[PDB]
């Protein structure tokens, strides 16, 4: 694939660690299911035909992975000659020792058959130096909702009836913190033998770290022919963990 005449003024590479953390918790707060899907994407502009050693802290427990076709399998880490441009290096999955960036603590209080009292607290759980962002919390309402009143100190919240959820949104929030929201759900009457099974509360967030604790140790570039070595390459790395399915039962 990768031709041989590749020459660049700046020999740069950018390492993207993209993780998707999935969690199902009890209202109590017990984890009922949790895994992390991951991939590592490389965007590089290096001259020649480079030999690349990618090094991480495999420490962490990685539970399977599939590679791209130019990988010398045999720590044993990964050596490879990368296509120019952008390509996916490896793709892994984790279930042990996962950082769960947010705890969602729900509280519901019936009031006759008219009202429903709802309080939901999110607890960020990471380095306070670090900011989660793009935070959304989804709280389903019943179908016989007549109307919804909400208050929250941080961020904004509307009741979307088309969707039967209260959607609370928070632009940023630092590790080890708390925010809470409170709603009064005004109810219509309905078929009383049919009770309301409480759908889970779901969250979406983005965090500048990998919730699987994968770190990147080294990416050593070796050029035999051309007169640049490893400590010449500008290297950059970011981690972007996002919520997959992330639901607290209630």
């Amino acid at each position: 694939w990768r031709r041989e005449g590749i020459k660049y003024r700046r020999n740069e590479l950018f390492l993207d660690v993209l993780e998707s953390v999935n969690l199902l918790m009890s209202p109590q707060g017990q984890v009922l299911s949790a895994h992390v899907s991951g991939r590592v994407v490389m965007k590089s502009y290096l001259s020649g035909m480079p030999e690349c050693k990618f090094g991480m802290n495999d420490s962490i427990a990685i539970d399977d992975c599939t590679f791209h076709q130019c990988v010398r399998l045999s720590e044993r880490s990964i050596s490879f000659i990368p296509p120019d441009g952008e390509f996916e290096l490896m793709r892994y999955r984790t279930t042990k020792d996962i950082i769960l960036p947010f705890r969602v603590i729900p509280l519901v209080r019936e009031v006759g058959r008219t009202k429903l009292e709802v309080k939901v607290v999110i607890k960020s759980n990471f380095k306070p130096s670090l900011l989660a962002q793009k935070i959304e919390v989804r709280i389903p309402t019943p179908l016989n909702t007549s109307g919804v009143q909400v208050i929250c100190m941080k961020g904004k919240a509307k009741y979307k009836a088309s969707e039967n959820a209260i959607v609370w949104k928070i632009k940023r929030m630092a590790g080890m913190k708390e925010s809470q929201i409170s709603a009064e759900i005004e109810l219509l009457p309905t078929n009383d033998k049919k009770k309301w099974a409480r759908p889970p509360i779901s969250m979406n967030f983005e965090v500048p770290f990998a919730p699987s604790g994968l770190k990147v140790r080294y990416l050593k570039v070796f050029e035999p022919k051309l007169n640049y070595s490893d400590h010449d390459v500008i290297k950059w790395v970011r981690y972007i963990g996002r919520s997959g399915i992330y639901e607290t039962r209630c």
Partner: peptide, 7 residues
């Protein structure tokens, strides 16, 4: 912003 430098 983008990234932070490898180290």
């Amino acid at each position: 912003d983008g990234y932070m430098p490898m180290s």
